């Protein structure tokens, strides 16, 4: 009966140590020899990000693109280091030579892709994500990808879990919804929590399922296949 698969951000597939190096290196490209810590200029930015998202959540989309860029210049001026003009040609080339995924996603994508519509839903701009994905090497692996930027309205508004069912073509009961944060609710879908290191134990009761890795999304899909 479920028909398809979808997961919440790019965190469930890449890694932490992977996506703390891209951040790291996008940082030291930025600054050079300029005199700041790199490792506090990303603390600091990565501060600010999490303000930003908070205070546009639930909000009519803005591009993600022009909030970061914001902060971005904020810093600049506050630090004194001139303002990257292509931070985004920057990223995107880190997240290329250092982006790391998690060991399982690519097989576990494959063998869910060909069974069921598998698709990723992001709280981002639809081309710069896209264009990450394709940079990670799984732009392909998906059936879609839903952004709120198509939605109109930045996570937790429902319209972007609506659209993603729409494109699937499914009722939510018929899908089940991956992903690392306790969102999808009221909405019909099966909530598999992913809890790779065993330190969300407190939200364990926020989610139907909860797996250590990708693998066992297979087996609970497979198990509620049967049932």
């Known amino acids: ?36 810590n790199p490792k506090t200029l990303l603390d600091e930015y990565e501060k600010l990000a999490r303000e930003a998202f908070s205070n546009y959540a639930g909000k009519p989309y803005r591009p993600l693109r022009d909030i970061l860029e914001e902060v971005m210049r904020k810093l600049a001026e506050k630090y004194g280091f001139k303002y990257p003009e292509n ?19 690519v097989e576990v994508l494959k063998s869910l892709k060909g069974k069921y ?12 994500a896209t264009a990450f994905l394709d940079a990670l090497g799984i732009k392909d692996l998906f059936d879609s990808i839903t952004t709120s930027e198509e939605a109109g309205f930045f996570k937790p508004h429902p319209r972007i879990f609506e659209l993603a069912l729409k494109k699937a073509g499914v009722k939510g009961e018929k899908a ?9 609710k009221n909405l019909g879908m099966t909530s598999i929590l992913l809890d790779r290191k065993g330190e969300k134990r407190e939200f364990w009761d926020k989610a139907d399922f909860i797996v250590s ?7 609970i899909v497979d198990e509620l296949n049967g049932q």
């Open 176 to 184: 089940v919804y991956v992903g690392d944060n306790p969102g999808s």
């Open 117 to 128: 519509h598998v698709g990723v839903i992001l709280n981002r701009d639809t081309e710069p």
């Open 1 to 36: 009966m479920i028909r398809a698969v979808f997961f919440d951000s790019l965190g469930t597939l890449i890694s932490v140590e992977g996506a703390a190096k891209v951040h790291l290196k996008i940082m030291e490209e930025v600054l050079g020899d300029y005199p700041l």
């Open 87 to 105: 931070l985004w040609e920057i990223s995107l080339r880190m997240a290329q030579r250092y982006g790391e995924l998690y060991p399982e996603v």
């Open 213 to 219: 890795d990708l693998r066992e999304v297979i087996k």
